């Protein structure tokens, strides 16, 4: 009876087997627009993408993960409200049985269709697990999805589905370019909070951009065709994985952009 999005394992579950649930910086939360506080010493965002090499994407029974080889200085992301540099280890969706919902962050209360995470981690504490046990271990850049025209960067991610349908399949998927999944513009959102998933752990700076992308209804239809279960189980559909927004408490959100 491990964690999930059900009924009985869901996100008003998991604070029984990780009680940071309920912390002081838990992810995500509402954006308030007009409560953030455009500020002016924030540097701008440093997205240097042109070198990440993928390594596979994998169905974990939570969502679909695209790694990366972060083994040599590449996919870095610097500036913005960061100190140093953080190096891109994966990114996953969160997605909706339906397009009114599925973002684990709300702008002014409203949903996306999805959310997309880029997980880095930062490099002077070495690796990923020695990361996510400080306080500035991750940056995870937060990009909303609107179901309208297809984004054709997110075609290949989106073929490669049907090959890592269940729960525990993986599968080769190098030379995906990231880049083709970013908007326009790098106006964020920054405010210092957690993994959004167990562990729970209040390791993260949040950058979350202003513009979504759109992607189309068929891209997200087939989101909406994997599965939760492993091959030979009874098919739920892998839909709703997304964690609703958590108490501010003791907090204030930051705007790059006036
Ligand atoms: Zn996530």
Redesign the pocket.
């Known amino acids: 009876h491990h964690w999930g999005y059900g009924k009985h394992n869901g996100p008003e579950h998991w604070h029984k087997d990780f009680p940071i649930a309920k912390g002081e910086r838990q992810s995500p939360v509402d954006i308030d627009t007009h409560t953030a506080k455009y500020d002016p010493s924030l540097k701008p965002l440093s997205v240097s993408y042109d070198q990440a090499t993928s390594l596979r994407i994998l169905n974990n029974g939570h969502?679909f993960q695209v790694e990366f080889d972060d083994s040599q200085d590449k996919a870095v992301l610097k500036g913005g409200p960061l100190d140093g540099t953080y190096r891109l280890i994966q990114f996953?969706?969160?997605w909706g049985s339906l397009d009114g919902q599925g973002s684990?962050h709300t702008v002014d209360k409203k949903k996306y269709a999805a959310?997309l995470?880029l997980?880095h981690w930062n490099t002077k504490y070495g690796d990923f697990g020695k990361a996510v046990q400080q306080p500035d271990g991750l940056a995870?850049l937060?990009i909303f999805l609107k179901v309208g025209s297809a984004k054709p960067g997110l075609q290949k991610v989106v073929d490669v589905l049907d090959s890592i349908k269940t729960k525990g399949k993986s599968a080769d998927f190098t030379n995906f370019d990231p880049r083709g999944l970013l908007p326009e513009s790098l106006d964020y959102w920054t405010y210092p909070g957690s993994?959004?998933?167990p562990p729970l752990l209040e390791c993260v700076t949040w950058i979350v951009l202003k513009e979504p992308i759109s992607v189309s209804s068929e891209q997200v239809l087939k989101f909406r065709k994997l599965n939760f279960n492993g091959e030979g189980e009874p098919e739920e559909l892998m839909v709703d994985n997304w964690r609703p927004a958590q108490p501010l408490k003791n907090r204030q959100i930051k705007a790059s952009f006036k």
Request: proline share 0%; glycine share 8%; net charge negative.
């Open positions: 969502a996953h969706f969160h684990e959310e995470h997980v995870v937060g993994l959004t998933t």
